Amino acid sequence: PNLVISVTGGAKNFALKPRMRKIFSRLIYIAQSKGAWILTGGTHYGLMKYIGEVVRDNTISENIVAI
Amino acid sequence: WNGQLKLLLEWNQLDLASDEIFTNDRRWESADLQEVMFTALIKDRPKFVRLFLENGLNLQKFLTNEVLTEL
């Protein structure tokens, strides 16, 4: 039902600031709740790795799909 | 960057280093923060340790056997 597109590649290095971190954690929680897609670059370095780790732990915690 | 970073760390001004230095967005390699983290732990600077961890530092990689035995 819902799609989200997060712009990737802007910064090679990403700062895990609480302001910039909790927002994306909540976004991923919302996407899991509504079964949304999230579209990212997929690079190992930057925000993509953080999003991937969040998704992995939430799955550990299936219903959420990231492409 | 290293001179300003070491100076601010010595004087323990978190805000100045966090805003003016770490907001540069330039690449932050592991060895940099390895050295500055080693010098931060000794001088009892917890906030700078938190800042380094947030900005990205594999603590498991940093904590070598040599570092732990020396500490």
Side-chain angles (χ1 to χ4, degrees), chain A residues 1-7 9-20 22-44 46-47 50-52 54-55 57-59 61 64-67, chain B residues 1-22 24 28-71:
Chain A
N2 180 17
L3 280 61
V4 183
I5 299 177
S6 297
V7 180
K12 304 268 70 169
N13 51 10
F14 178 81
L16 199 167
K17 188 179 182 64
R19 195 67 46 75
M20 192 71 165
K22 191 184 188 302
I23 282 175
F24 285 79
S25 69
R26 292 301 310 174
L27 173 60
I28 297 165
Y29 170 78
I30 294 164
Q32 177 178 5
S33 179
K34 301 194 183 306
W37 276 349
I38 60 169
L39 303 189
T40 60
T43 66
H44 185 267
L47 183 272
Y50 169 73
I51 300 294
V54 174
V55 171
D57 66 48
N58 274 24
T59 56
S61 175
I64 187 168
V65 170
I67 299 175
Chain B
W1 54 266
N2 187 15
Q4 303 177 13
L5 177 55
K6 285 179 171 179
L7 179 60
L8 276 38
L9 188 149
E10 205 291 331
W11 286 94
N12 190 22
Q13 278 189 316
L14 172 64
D15 187 317
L16 213 173
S18 63
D19 304 10
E20 299 194 4
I21 290 174
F22 270 127
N24 184 315
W28 297 100
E29 303 300 341
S30 180
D32 302 351
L33 297 177
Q34 161 161 14
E35 169 47 36
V36 192
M37 183 83 157
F38 189 6
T39 197
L41 284 175
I42 289 166
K43 294 179 181 176
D44 187 3
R45 297 280 187 266
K47 291 154 61 177
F48 265 79
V49 166
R50 183 186 297 278
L51 182 69
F52 295 140
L53 293 181
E54 288 180 1
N55 290 329
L57 171 56
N58 185 325
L59 191 53
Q60 295 184 6
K61 284 173 53 52
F62 166 64
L63 292 179
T64 72
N65 181 15
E66 168 54 24
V67 170
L68 283 175
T69 182
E70 179 275 353
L71 185 58

